Structures are given as C-alpha cells and as structure tokens.
C-alpha cells in the first residue's frame, strides 16, 4: 500500500511535474511514481507518466520475492534520488546490464552498481528488448500513461538518511571487504583487487552498504539491527482522503505539538485532538518500516545511506 497517496489516474501525458518543497509532498509524488516519470522525461525525452493506476506499490522487482518492498516506508534508490540523497545516473554504454530480470517491455529499470546507481530509460513509444540492451518501438506504450509493471527496480534495497563516517573508517571497511572477497578482481568495471588474468564479467549477488564514499562496502559475514528512532522524517503529514499537507503545515505539525497524530507521533512530537468548528486538520503518522538499520561489519557499527542485496557484474581471478 502507499505511504500517503493512492496510485495516480493521470488524464493526459502533457501535464507538468512541479517541484514540491514539503517532505510529505515529495513522498506523495514518490507514491505516484512521479519521480520515475520525471527521470524518464529529463533523460529519455519520454512523454507522460509511468505508474498509471498502480503507483509505486505495483513496481516490478528483481528478484520478485523482495523483502524490503513489503515495507512501503523503505526507500528505493529512485525514491532517495527524489529526496536529494543520491543520484540515479543515466546509463552509459559501458554500464553492464545484469542477466536475470525480465527486461522485455520495460520502460525504466535501475540497479545499484559498485560505485553508484544507474538507470536505463526508453523514449516515447519504445520499450526494452528481451535482453535489455536496446529500446524498440512498442505500440503498447503509445498513450504515455503506462502501468507500474513497466518500471523495474533491481535489488532488495533500503535507503535512509545516513550518519556520515570519516575516511579512516571507510578505508578499514574497504580493506575488510577485500580480505573477504580475495578472488574478485573488478566489480562493475571498478578495480576491487589488483589482478592480471581475469574472468569475463559475471552476475554476482552480494550484500553491500553505501557509506557515502567512493564505492560500496560489500559484505559476506555481517549483522544488521533495525531500530525505530522516531525522527521527523519517520512521519508523514496529510489530511484523510485529500493527500499531503503543505510545507508550512507540515513544519507546524512537526514543531509545535498542535496537530493530530497517531500514537507514536503523540508519544514523540506531541499532538492535540478536538474539537474543531469545521474541516479536518493535518495529521501525522508513522511511516511503515522496521526503522533505521545499523550494520555491524568488520568490528564496526555503521548507519549507512543505503543497504541492500542485489546483483552486480564481477570478474574473478584466473590463474
């Protein structure tokens, strides 16, 4: 289900996509896949929208049995991009498309890579071939009001506001990863260990975290703990049936203790209920997720920007 807003029923492909300043306003655009729509328009000159009727909850995932997608409040890379936390960059010819997903008919797909996040788009009237390598014309996409299953998010991924770590901690994490995967040479074309002879690039499923430096920390043995911290971004503010509150309304609810709220919002930021002369006022409620994830790895505890399990392309040592 959605964080705030049920799936869009757009009426035309030409409607503009406004920039919205409020957090809950942004969340509602995310619920409606307006951010992926905006990405496609910027980068592929796509016309219109993805997510018609279905919204974010009906996106396709690889693998399809996807743990974090069950929690509407966990952010995907595209979600985090819209919130300014990272950038899903337009794919270049050198970015490798992983085998496994069902690419045929897709209009957008995205995967984490070793050093970032990459998206592949299609222009108006086109969709992806079975291999994902090319866009071909597809009469099923002519309306420009496309369903959510045309959007493919690769990986079991959760993004979250990060607690930055110093370079010294990154370099010790990085050395621990190297010691855990001594046979890997490159990942997604990025040197991981020094090698001479190497395999061809191969699909590689791995746990990883993005800790905000030059590349991800990939992990074999690691521990995670989820704790609900009830920070201000863990709540959204809306009115029943009518969508997100404005930026200034949201700021009032999350600073003054004077708005309606669910129990956890009352418990943390304060709430006031009843009475009113007329019209329902703003309410804030807890976003549905396990909380904030802390990763134990190599003797360190880190609150990463993103954490996930997903497929990348790796070469292996040959000797």
């Amino acid at each position: 289900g959605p964080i705030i807003c049920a799936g869009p029923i757009h009426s035309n492909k030409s409607a503009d996509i406004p920039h919205l300043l409020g957090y809950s306003e942004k969340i509602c655009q995310i619920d409606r896949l307006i951010h992926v729509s905006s990405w496609l328009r910027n980068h592929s000159q796509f016309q219109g929208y993805v997510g018609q009727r279905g919204g974010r909850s009906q996106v396709s995932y690889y693998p399809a049995e996807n743990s974090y997608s069950r929690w509407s409040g966990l952010l995907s890379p595209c979600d985090a991009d819209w919130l300014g936390m990272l950038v899903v960059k337009k794919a270049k010819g050198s970015d490798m498309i992983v085998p496994g997903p069902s690419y045929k008919g897709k209009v957008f797909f995205e995967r984490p890579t070793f050093d970032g996040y990459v998206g592949w788009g299609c222009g108006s009237g086109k969709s992806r071939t079975e291999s994902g390598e090319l866009c071909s014309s597809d009469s099923g996409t002519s309306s420009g009001l496309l369903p959510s299953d045309r959007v493919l998010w690769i990986g079991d991924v959760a993004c979250q506001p990060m607690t930055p770590i110093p370079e010294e901690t990154f370099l010790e994490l990085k050395s621990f990863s190297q010691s855990e995967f001594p046979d890997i040479c490159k990942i997604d074309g990025i040197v991981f260990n020094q090698c001479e002879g190497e395999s061809l690039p191969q699909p590689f499923d791995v746990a990883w975290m993005d800790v905000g430096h030059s590349h991800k920390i990939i992990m074999r043995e690691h521990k995670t703990k989820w704790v609900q911290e009830s920070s201000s971004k863990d709540f959204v503010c809306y009115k029943e049936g009518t969508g997100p509150c404005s930026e200034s309304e949201e700021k009032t609810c999350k600073t003054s203790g004077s708005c309606r709220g669910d129990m956890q919002f009352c418990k943390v930021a304060g709430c006031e209920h009843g009475e009113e002369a007329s019209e329902a006022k703003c309410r804030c409620s807890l976003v549905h997720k396990p909380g904030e994830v802390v990763v134990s790895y190599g003797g360190m505890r880190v609150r990463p920007k993103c954490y996930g399990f997903s497929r990348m392309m790796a070469t292996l040592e040959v000797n």
Partner: protein
C-alpha cells in the same frame, strides 16, 4: 471453551415456500439461557423477533412477528430454530440468533453472544445468467457495464481481465421487483484513451456457469 452460536447457511427460496433455519449453541449450558432471533432487512437496522428458553420451550414473540414465525429448540442437539410456513418476498433479510444474558430481577436481559447470521433470499425467479450492456462514454471520462437480470447472487466483475482495478466502482446489486438482481460497474478513464485503449468488462455468474466479456466502446 467459549460460547459459540453457529447458524446454518444462506437460503434461496420462492414465495409461499416453507423454511426452517437453525442456530447451534456450544460452550455453555444450553438449557439455561434464552436464545433470541433478530431480523435485519437489507440496509436497515435490527428488529427483535422472539426468544425461546430451551429448558422448557417457553417462547415470547415481538407483537410484530407473533403469528408470523415460530421459534423452537431441540435441547438434545443444542439447536434453536426459526421457521416460516409460507415465505413472502419481504422476508428477504439477514437473521441473527443471539444468546440472552439475564442479570437479576429488574430487566429482561441483553444479547451477549451472536451467531454469524443467515442470509435468506425470497424470489420467484429461477437461476439465470446476466445480460451485460455497455455504459458507453459519455480530462477523464466514465464508462461501464450494466449487469442486469441475473439470479441468484453473486456475479463477479473485472475489467480487462483484472489488469484494470484502480478507479473501478462495482455497485452493490439490487434485488428488483422482478426477483432478479441488477448492478453496474463503472470506471474512470482518460478521455484521450477513448478509441485507442480497449476496455472490456468480464462478468462471471457461477450459479449459471456463464462468462460474458463485453467490450465498451464510444458512440
């Protein structure tokens, strides 16, 4: 063990037919508590019909139902009953049984545990599959399907074989005076898709083993 009242299943009868529905009590001393029956006509409130004390089969009826129904009990099988000699169309309703809890000499008791209810449908019609008619269109537009003259409930309605679910309203069936049901299912669509998108409503009536796919087109 907790108190449970389990009623018999839904009934479909013709006018002037007889009908006996049942309510089986478990988890308590059956002979020692009144059992009541409560009628709920479609879209209306609750009306008390009568009570029976299974210990000695003493009965009390509301004046509204006295002489119209008979309430009985069989304590050998912990079951209470409600029955009609000759049903009318206006007996279509949900019927609940409920156990009466008495506390003292001042009042008459309240209903502390309820059965799940028995739907009774009275129509002179026999099993019949629906006719499906387009609601032709007509920013956004509305289109739909009129699913008319079927019996009994239920029909199921989907759009584009289930690919289209958001923005659909399938209204509750109405039991017409002909004894047949009718409903409409409508959906909101972009006007610009009228003529480029195909909209088909799939209507399935299991009691008549009928499936109908109806394409809904402009003009």
């Amino acid at each position: 063990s907790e108190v449970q009242l389990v009623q018999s299943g839904a009934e479909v009868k013709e006018p002037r037919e007889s009908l006996k529905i049942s309510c089986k009590g478990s988890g308590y001393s059956f002979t020692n508590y009144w059992i009541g029956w409560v009628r709920q006509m479609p879209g209306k409130g609750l009306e008390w019909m009568g009570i029976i004390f299974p210990g000695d089969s003493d009965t009390r009826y509301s004046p509204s139902f006295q002489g119209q129904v008979t309430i009985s009990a069989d304590k050998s099988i912990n079951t209470a009953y409600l029955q009609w000699s000759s049903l009318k169309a206006s007996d279509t309703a949900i019927y609940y049984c409920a156990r009466l809890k008495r506390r003292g000499f001042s009042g008459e008791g309240y209903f502390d545990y309820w059965g799940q209810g028995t739907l009774v449908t009275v129509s002179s019609a026999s099993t019949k599959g629906p006719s499906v008619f387009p609601l032709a269109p007509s920013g956004t537009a509305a289109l739909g399907c009129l699913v008319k003259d079927y019996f009994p409930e239920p029909v199921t309605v989907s759009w584009n074989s289930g690919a289209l679910t958001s923005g659909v309203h399938t209204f509750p069936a109405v039991l017409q005076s002909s004894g047949l049901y009718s409903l409409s299912s409508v959906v909101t669509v972009p006007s610009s898709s009228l003529g480029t998108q195909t909209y088909i409503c799939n209507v399935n009536h299991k009691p008549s083993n009928t499936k109908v796919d109806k394409r809904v087109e402009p003009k």
